[PDB]
Design an enzyme around this catalytic site. Structure first.
Site, mmCIF file in Angstrom:
data_model
loop_
_atom_site.group_PDB
_atom_site.id
_atom_site.type_symbol
_atom_site.label_atom_id
_atom_site.label_comp_id
_atom_site.label_asym_id
_atom_site.label_seq_id
_atom_site.Cartn_x
_atom_site.Cartn_y
_atom_site.Cartn_z
ATOM 1 N N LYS A 281 0.604 -1.164 -0.273
ATOM 2 C CA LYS A 281 0.149 -0.329 0.276
ATOM 3 C C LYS A 281 0.655 0.971 -0.086
ATOM 4 O O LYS A 281 1.484 2.204 1.149
ATOM 5 C CB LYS A 281 -0.945 -0.164 1.177
ATOM 6 C CG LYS A 281 -2.173 0.057 1.076
ATOM 7 C CD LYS A 281 -3.257 -0.246 2.334
ATOM 8 C CE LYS A 281 -4.486 0.702 2.116
ATOM 9 N NZ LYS A 281 -5.135 0.191 1.557
HETATM 10 C C1 LIG Z 1 -6.039 -0.331 1.125
HETATM 11 C C2 LIG Z 1 -6.658 -0.898 -0.012
HETATM 12 C C3 LIG Z 1 -7.989 -1.918 -0.167
HETATM 13 C C4 LIG Z 1 -8.776 -2.305 0.948
HETATM 14 O O1 LIG Z 1 -8.074 -3.490 2.055
HETATM 15 P P1 LIG Z 1 -8.972 -3.181 3.334
HETATM 16 O O2 LIG Z 1 -6.969 -3.052 3.989
HETATM 17 O O3 LIG Z 1 -9.962 -3.727 2.421
HETATM 18 O O4 LIG Z 1 -9.009 -1.970 3.548
HETATM 19 C C5 LIG Z 1 -8.054 -2.499 -1.917
HETATM 20 N N1 LIG Z 1 -7.740 -1.994 -3.013
HETATM 21 C C6 LIG Z 1 -7.000 -1.164 -3.079
HETATM 22 C C7 LIG Z 1 -5.872 -1.155 -4.428
HETATM 23 C C8 LIG Z 1 -6.018 -0.721 -1.339
HETATM 24 O O5 LIG Z 1 -4.917 0.057 -1.239
#
Ligand SMILES: *Cc1c(COP(=O)(O)O)cnc(C)c1O
Ligand SMILES: *Cc1c(COP(=O)(O)O)cnc(C)c1O
Ligand SMILES: *Cc1c(COP(=O)(O)O)cnc(C)c1O
Ligand SMILES: *Cc1c(COP(=O)(O)O)cnc(C)c1O
Ligand SMILES: *Cc1c(COP(=O)(O)O)cnc(C)c1O
Ligand SMILES: *Cc1c(COP(=O)(O)O)cnc(C)c1O
Lengths: 295, 296, 296, 296, 295, 296
Positions: free
Chosen positions: E150
């Site tokens: 992320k």
């Molecule tokens: C943060 C994110 C998600 C969702 O993840 P959670 O951990 O469920 O909040 C989905 N796709 C992408 C590209 C993200 O950056």
């Protein structure tokens, strides 16, 4: 029957490499194809230096150390033809390869042998025109193999094409690159004519930079035929006023059929094919610097 | 100097040679195998011999090479080859099928292959304690261009580019991504990761060669209760892996202790699988004794 | 002449025509289906009628074509077309949905489709004993460019390219790779291989049309205990398969005995699937009687 | 009613129909054209008739459709259709080549096409003052899968996908990227940008249809001294362009004043090309009088 | 108004980074999104450790050194919420970034700062269902950026999608990967229901491994809803019996329209959305180990 | 400690900071510039200042960031910034445009950018005598995923992966291939090769950032009679190149003396172009003096 091998003429039967060579086992070598033409008065090798220069460029590209200069390989060709007393059309195969047995893929520091065979040779493709087919196989891509080198392992790809076209009842393949652009026959460069303009795919589309393609570009400029190095699609091949293959073996071969679609045996092709023969036959003074007399 | 089998006959290794005009040398049209025999004190056992020779013949049918021997005939040939040299030590055996005719034309139809079999002493291809690996710039050649599931000679020019790139730049071995940028292989090894207790290895369709050492690991993982998924691996899953290893005939089970400078433990699953594989090849697991061909 | 259904009327086949300025003709904006009926000697059974009509409707919603009929309506309309013609023999039934209004503009929004349904006598589409196949130069049209899961008219220019390429050389049928290089389709058939006792078929995501013959084959495999995997297939796995076959409404179950000159046996799995399919469509498998719609 | 040419006969437009079982309807195996005629007050001139008919024929040979008429024949057939109808106003003329025989099989070899030619009153296709465009989610169908340079029927399902996507959001037109990510086409128009005094248009190889309006624009640029490059265009160069416009028979020269919300001026190059094109098609440019076919 | 920053609570206004930071200038950071739910009795942080564990996995993937453990970041969250006395729904943003000014792209050895902001937060997406559109932008590919992290610079891609969908009059984007397979919303994982089977794209298709996706897979298995991690095409989205987005911010959001094609607000989605709320609200004893009470 | 311009005002560099919640920091939504000023003894000259600020604003329009300053205003801001610090030495100037609001939501529409300008002493980014370069495993991000022709902040995470990979593994700098495997850039430099006397640089459409140092080299090549082709470069053309160099604002003209272990001469064209560039930036070529903004 004499072949040059690492500085010595040896009989055909001693020009052999161990079956454990990483060149045999891993497609790790380079090669060239060179013609010599008998004109009744001499035997001339066509663009000898340029080929030996590309042999060495191919090695440098794949990281094969060839311990000869282009001049010493050039000399070796002429010495190989004289040894055999050939006074006839020849194809000449230089191949550079590793002489040592080795199972490891780590070929750093190894030092190639080179052998030079000269053999009697007629026509590769039918002189009045071939039937071609686009094949299912795509040309190996620059991201996986250094395709601007005439490197031996690449030609597996070329073999799959040549065989497919041939088993399917055609004379030669046409290969599309990864992006779907027409690039090559199985061993040939390709030219089309579109409304009086000659087109051949550019260096970057995945082609090997052919010496016969280069001669063709010079011939065009002598004849004032406008020429572009530009990507070709199948559709432009299907809709071509003329099309032809070029290569050392192929010479200038009209393509009179692509995937069932008839092409004219056209006039631009005939003029190029005619002037290329005059050239190799030593009948065009201006291009004499590319003929090496053997005797 | 060793005896080498060559089309049915035993010759000195100096006579096991092929014309420099062979379309095999010039255009990479051939197939090969890598097979080990293991000295256990009692006998010399060739490992998964029949399976490798069947793969030789699948390789050949895939590239359109006509090999005029059966798997059983080839397997006997290996046994006769090792005996005639009276080896009683660890060997690497290389079968190589190729065209012994000089031919300039790419149209290789109708030609019949020769087969040579060399058996040589050998050796560990990789550091048992582990290797450092790099993701290389070169992509693994693609199925749409070469039949990469054949152990076909010309394809290896791709492996060489990889192997030289990793090594030249410091590392012991390469990792190559496919055209779709998923992790596929080493330069001559299959790859496994361990993520959260799960073994992962790239599946057949991603571009691998289907390794016999790979297959053996999948059997071992079942014996050992380690969950296994043939599933695409991304470079991020590599970086985050709890453990990673290479497998192959020469390679055996080689831990990867670094990927692109990121450090990996020499882990417990890798060691368990390495340990069992050694038991298996040395004839210590009853269930696997049909994999071992005794030479004497 | 024979009667054809056109928008809720049985018309003679010479009236079943559409203006040459329809955007369905000029721009391939239509959907269709292929349905068989089989005569068993007692009755004529239409095979999986409602599943075919449900899929017509999914094909339309996929492309944004507005079909003003339900599955149920279209199903009944078939049954009346067959009855109108007094057929008592094997048929191929073609539902075709398309725009009957003339329109140059590509903005086909809000137009309402017509449906025509023809029932025609029809024997076999491919040789029963097996066909020779060629992997073609044409790739299957990609999901990023048209909605391949829809049985949509304009997509089949690609299928014709493939079909003609193979047949121009005297092969019986085409195999098409997807953009990523994996085997997906014949020109008009789904593909199955058998590889080491396991039946494999390319999966949904690869670019196939979700065949109903495919779906039947998957149910039959479960019935028969044949392990089945929906996994990407390479060219190498096709060349090396133990067996291979095409499936489709017109194709039924056709063995593939040659691919790019590589011979494959007419195998036992393919035979057993072919024999079971035949018994199902003739009403001899009581569990499947719900798939069979009686005409009389 | 209005008269339409169908295979060498002038028929009322209600007879200009094709069986709903044509493989042209069911599989998008056809070609078409778009030709305008313009009324200047003295006469009705058909613009580049022979070039359009030559291109119909190239489209057919590309797809393997057998059109039994020459360019010259089709050209005359247009002129008679216009005359038959007594038109004295701007028209769009649609030649459509397709198979009039019913055929389920994809093997369209050796069939002979029909040609229908309709002439219809027609004003503008896009706003003269400029249109707002959206780059769409749909990519242009790729040469590896259909022969995009042919004006072939089945390809336009992709164009409809794009056209509807843009219009469903209230934009006037689509821009489509090719598989490699370069701008190539509107749904039915070629695209030009101006970037630092240089007119740029995607080149032939990128996946465009070779428009005749495109070709005209290229001649006009030479006449006017405007430097012109046939080079791949990215999305970034579109966003940043000084100017942009679509060209096509129906489109003429339409300024693009918005792309993905990024405003572009209605520019001087586009205006000067639009004004020159207008004078050419009305017979006010004597050098171009050969492109204008008088009807009366 | 208090924010944690490198081990200290500082006012909102001091939680700032130099404009010459290579994190700002080069998209070189990682971040997380964590919810806390007020149930009337306590405030519970949902799957705190799992998020901080992924924060550190993200850093390791992009080679950012974060000098805190998941436990110390977890503690810092709870301490950040207590400092502010929040007794209400929150979104929590941990972000890791470089504190130093630096123009060089060579970030080796640098050491991240981490800041932890907790802010009052309602709904991201309309709870009764959104209208979605496939966008022109494709998800950045694993060969160019490590998308399983992320990582902050990646979300330019996500921004282009979110903005395109939104400027075009929809609520959210759907992005296709380089191979054309449906992978993600702009910040959401995606699920379909196809004939009673739940499908979501696998790790390898280019997705970020969401914690809300993971919870959804557990919920499915509790409910005996058969589930596959399998590639999804647009066509399967168009033909879906149900579809929904999941994410920390999104929660469980039905997708009731894709590219103009209406989807049922279906029963599988409603059962998951209902059980997820019971979970975060602390009403399902079995899933209490994922709630961290703040008071 | 330096003064930094920030939205119109001069502040100490310690106050030129932005909220950690900014969508710019968290989601890489911003743009930037790199600009040099050169001390020549007589004055401080900023190089191609207006061109860089126009690029800032093109970057911004490409990514949909609203920068509320003109190019002229930004250019004055740089001059005021350098003066207020009274620098009389070589500088690197970094303009950075970003969102100073905390915002969690990805919907950045409507927001207005801030702009900071820092001017700092600096420095040679690369070894003047030359660098060793590696082709990296990481591909340059693609136009279909990010607008790579913008100097946009988030894209650089790709550059970082590259730069770290080259450096970690021994080398001074990376070379990155595009998705189609053509040579495109360094990690923050454009690339030139010299083949057979011809300068080659990848064209706009291949994925580069359009460098101002690149543009200046194209002008220099014209002054010097060195033929130049904006043309795709393959890794083979790199390996065989007679000379290669990087260009960019920080980089200046940096010879590449090794590519993947293969040695390159520090060549004569590179040196000629390097030498002229230095004359140009130091105010010794009359023709280029409109490129130099004097500070005092
Ligand atoms: C943060 C994110 C998600 C969702 O993840 P959670 O951990 O469920 O909040 C989905 N796709 C992408 C590209 C993200 O950056
Ligand atoms: C050798 C070769 C050519 C032809 O080159 P010449 O130098 O003209 O003989 C064309 N294409 C490929 C792939 C080749 O290997
Ligand atoms: C031979 C080979 C392997 C290993 O196969 P084994 O059968 O285990 O020896 C793995 N990958 C590639 C590319 C190979 O050629
Ligand atoms: C119709 C079709 C099939 C087979 O589907 P069935 O319903 O089984 O007849 C397979 N592939 C394609 C491309 C098709 O159009
Ligand atoms: C017909 C067409 C054009 C425009 O061609 P013109 O001859 O100029 O009318 C452009 N693009 C596509 C895709 C087309 O089908
Ligand atoms: C900034 C940049 C360059 C160099 O641009 P100049 O304007 O010459 O400083 C080259 N490539 C990339 C990727 C860049 O960001």
């Amino acid at each position: 029957m004499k072949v040059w091998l690492d500085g010595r003429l040896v009989d055909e039967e001693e020009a052999k490499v161990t079956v454990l060579s990483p060149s045999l086992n891993y497609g790790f070598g380079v090669f060239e194809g060179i013609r010599a033409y008998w004109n009744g008065e001499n035997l001339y090798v066509f663009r000898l230096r340029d080929h030996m220069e590309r042999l060495l460029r191919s090695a440098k590209i794949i990281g094969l150390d060839v311990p000869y200069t282009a001049e010493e390989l050039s000399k070796a060709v002429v010495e190989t033809v004289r040894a055999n007393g050939f006074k006839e059309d020849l194809y000449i195969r230089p191949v550079a390869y590793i002489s040592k047995p080795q199972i490891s893929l780590d070929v750093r520091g190894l030092q190639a042998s080179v052998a030079i065979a000269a053999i009697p040779f007629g026509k590769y493709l039918k002189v009045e025109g071939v039937r071609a087919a686009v094949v299912s196989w795509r040309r190996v891509h620059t991201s996986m193999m250094p395709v601007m080198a005439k490197a031996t392992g690449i030609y597996l790809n070329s073999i799959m094409a040549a065989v497919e076209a041939r088993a399917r009842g055609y004379d030669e393949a046409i290969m599309l690159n990864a992006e779907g652009k027409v690039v090559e026959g199985s061993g040939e460069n390709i030219f089309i004519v579109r409304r009086g303009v000659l087109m051949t795919p550019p260096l970057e589309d995945g082609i090997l930079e052919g010496i016969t393609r280069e001669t063709v570009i010079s011939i065009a400029g002598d004849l004032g035929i406008p020429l572009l190095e530009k990507s070709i699609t199948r559709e432009e091949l299907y809709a071509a006023d003329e099309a032809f293959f070029v290569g050392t073996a192929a010479e200038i071969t009209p393509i009179i059929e692509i995937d069932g679609r008839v092409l004219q045996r056209g006039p631009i092709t005939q003029k190029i094919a005619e002037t290329y023969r005059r050239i190799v036959l030593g009948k065009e003074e201006k291009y004499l610097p590319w003929l090496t007399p053997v005797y």
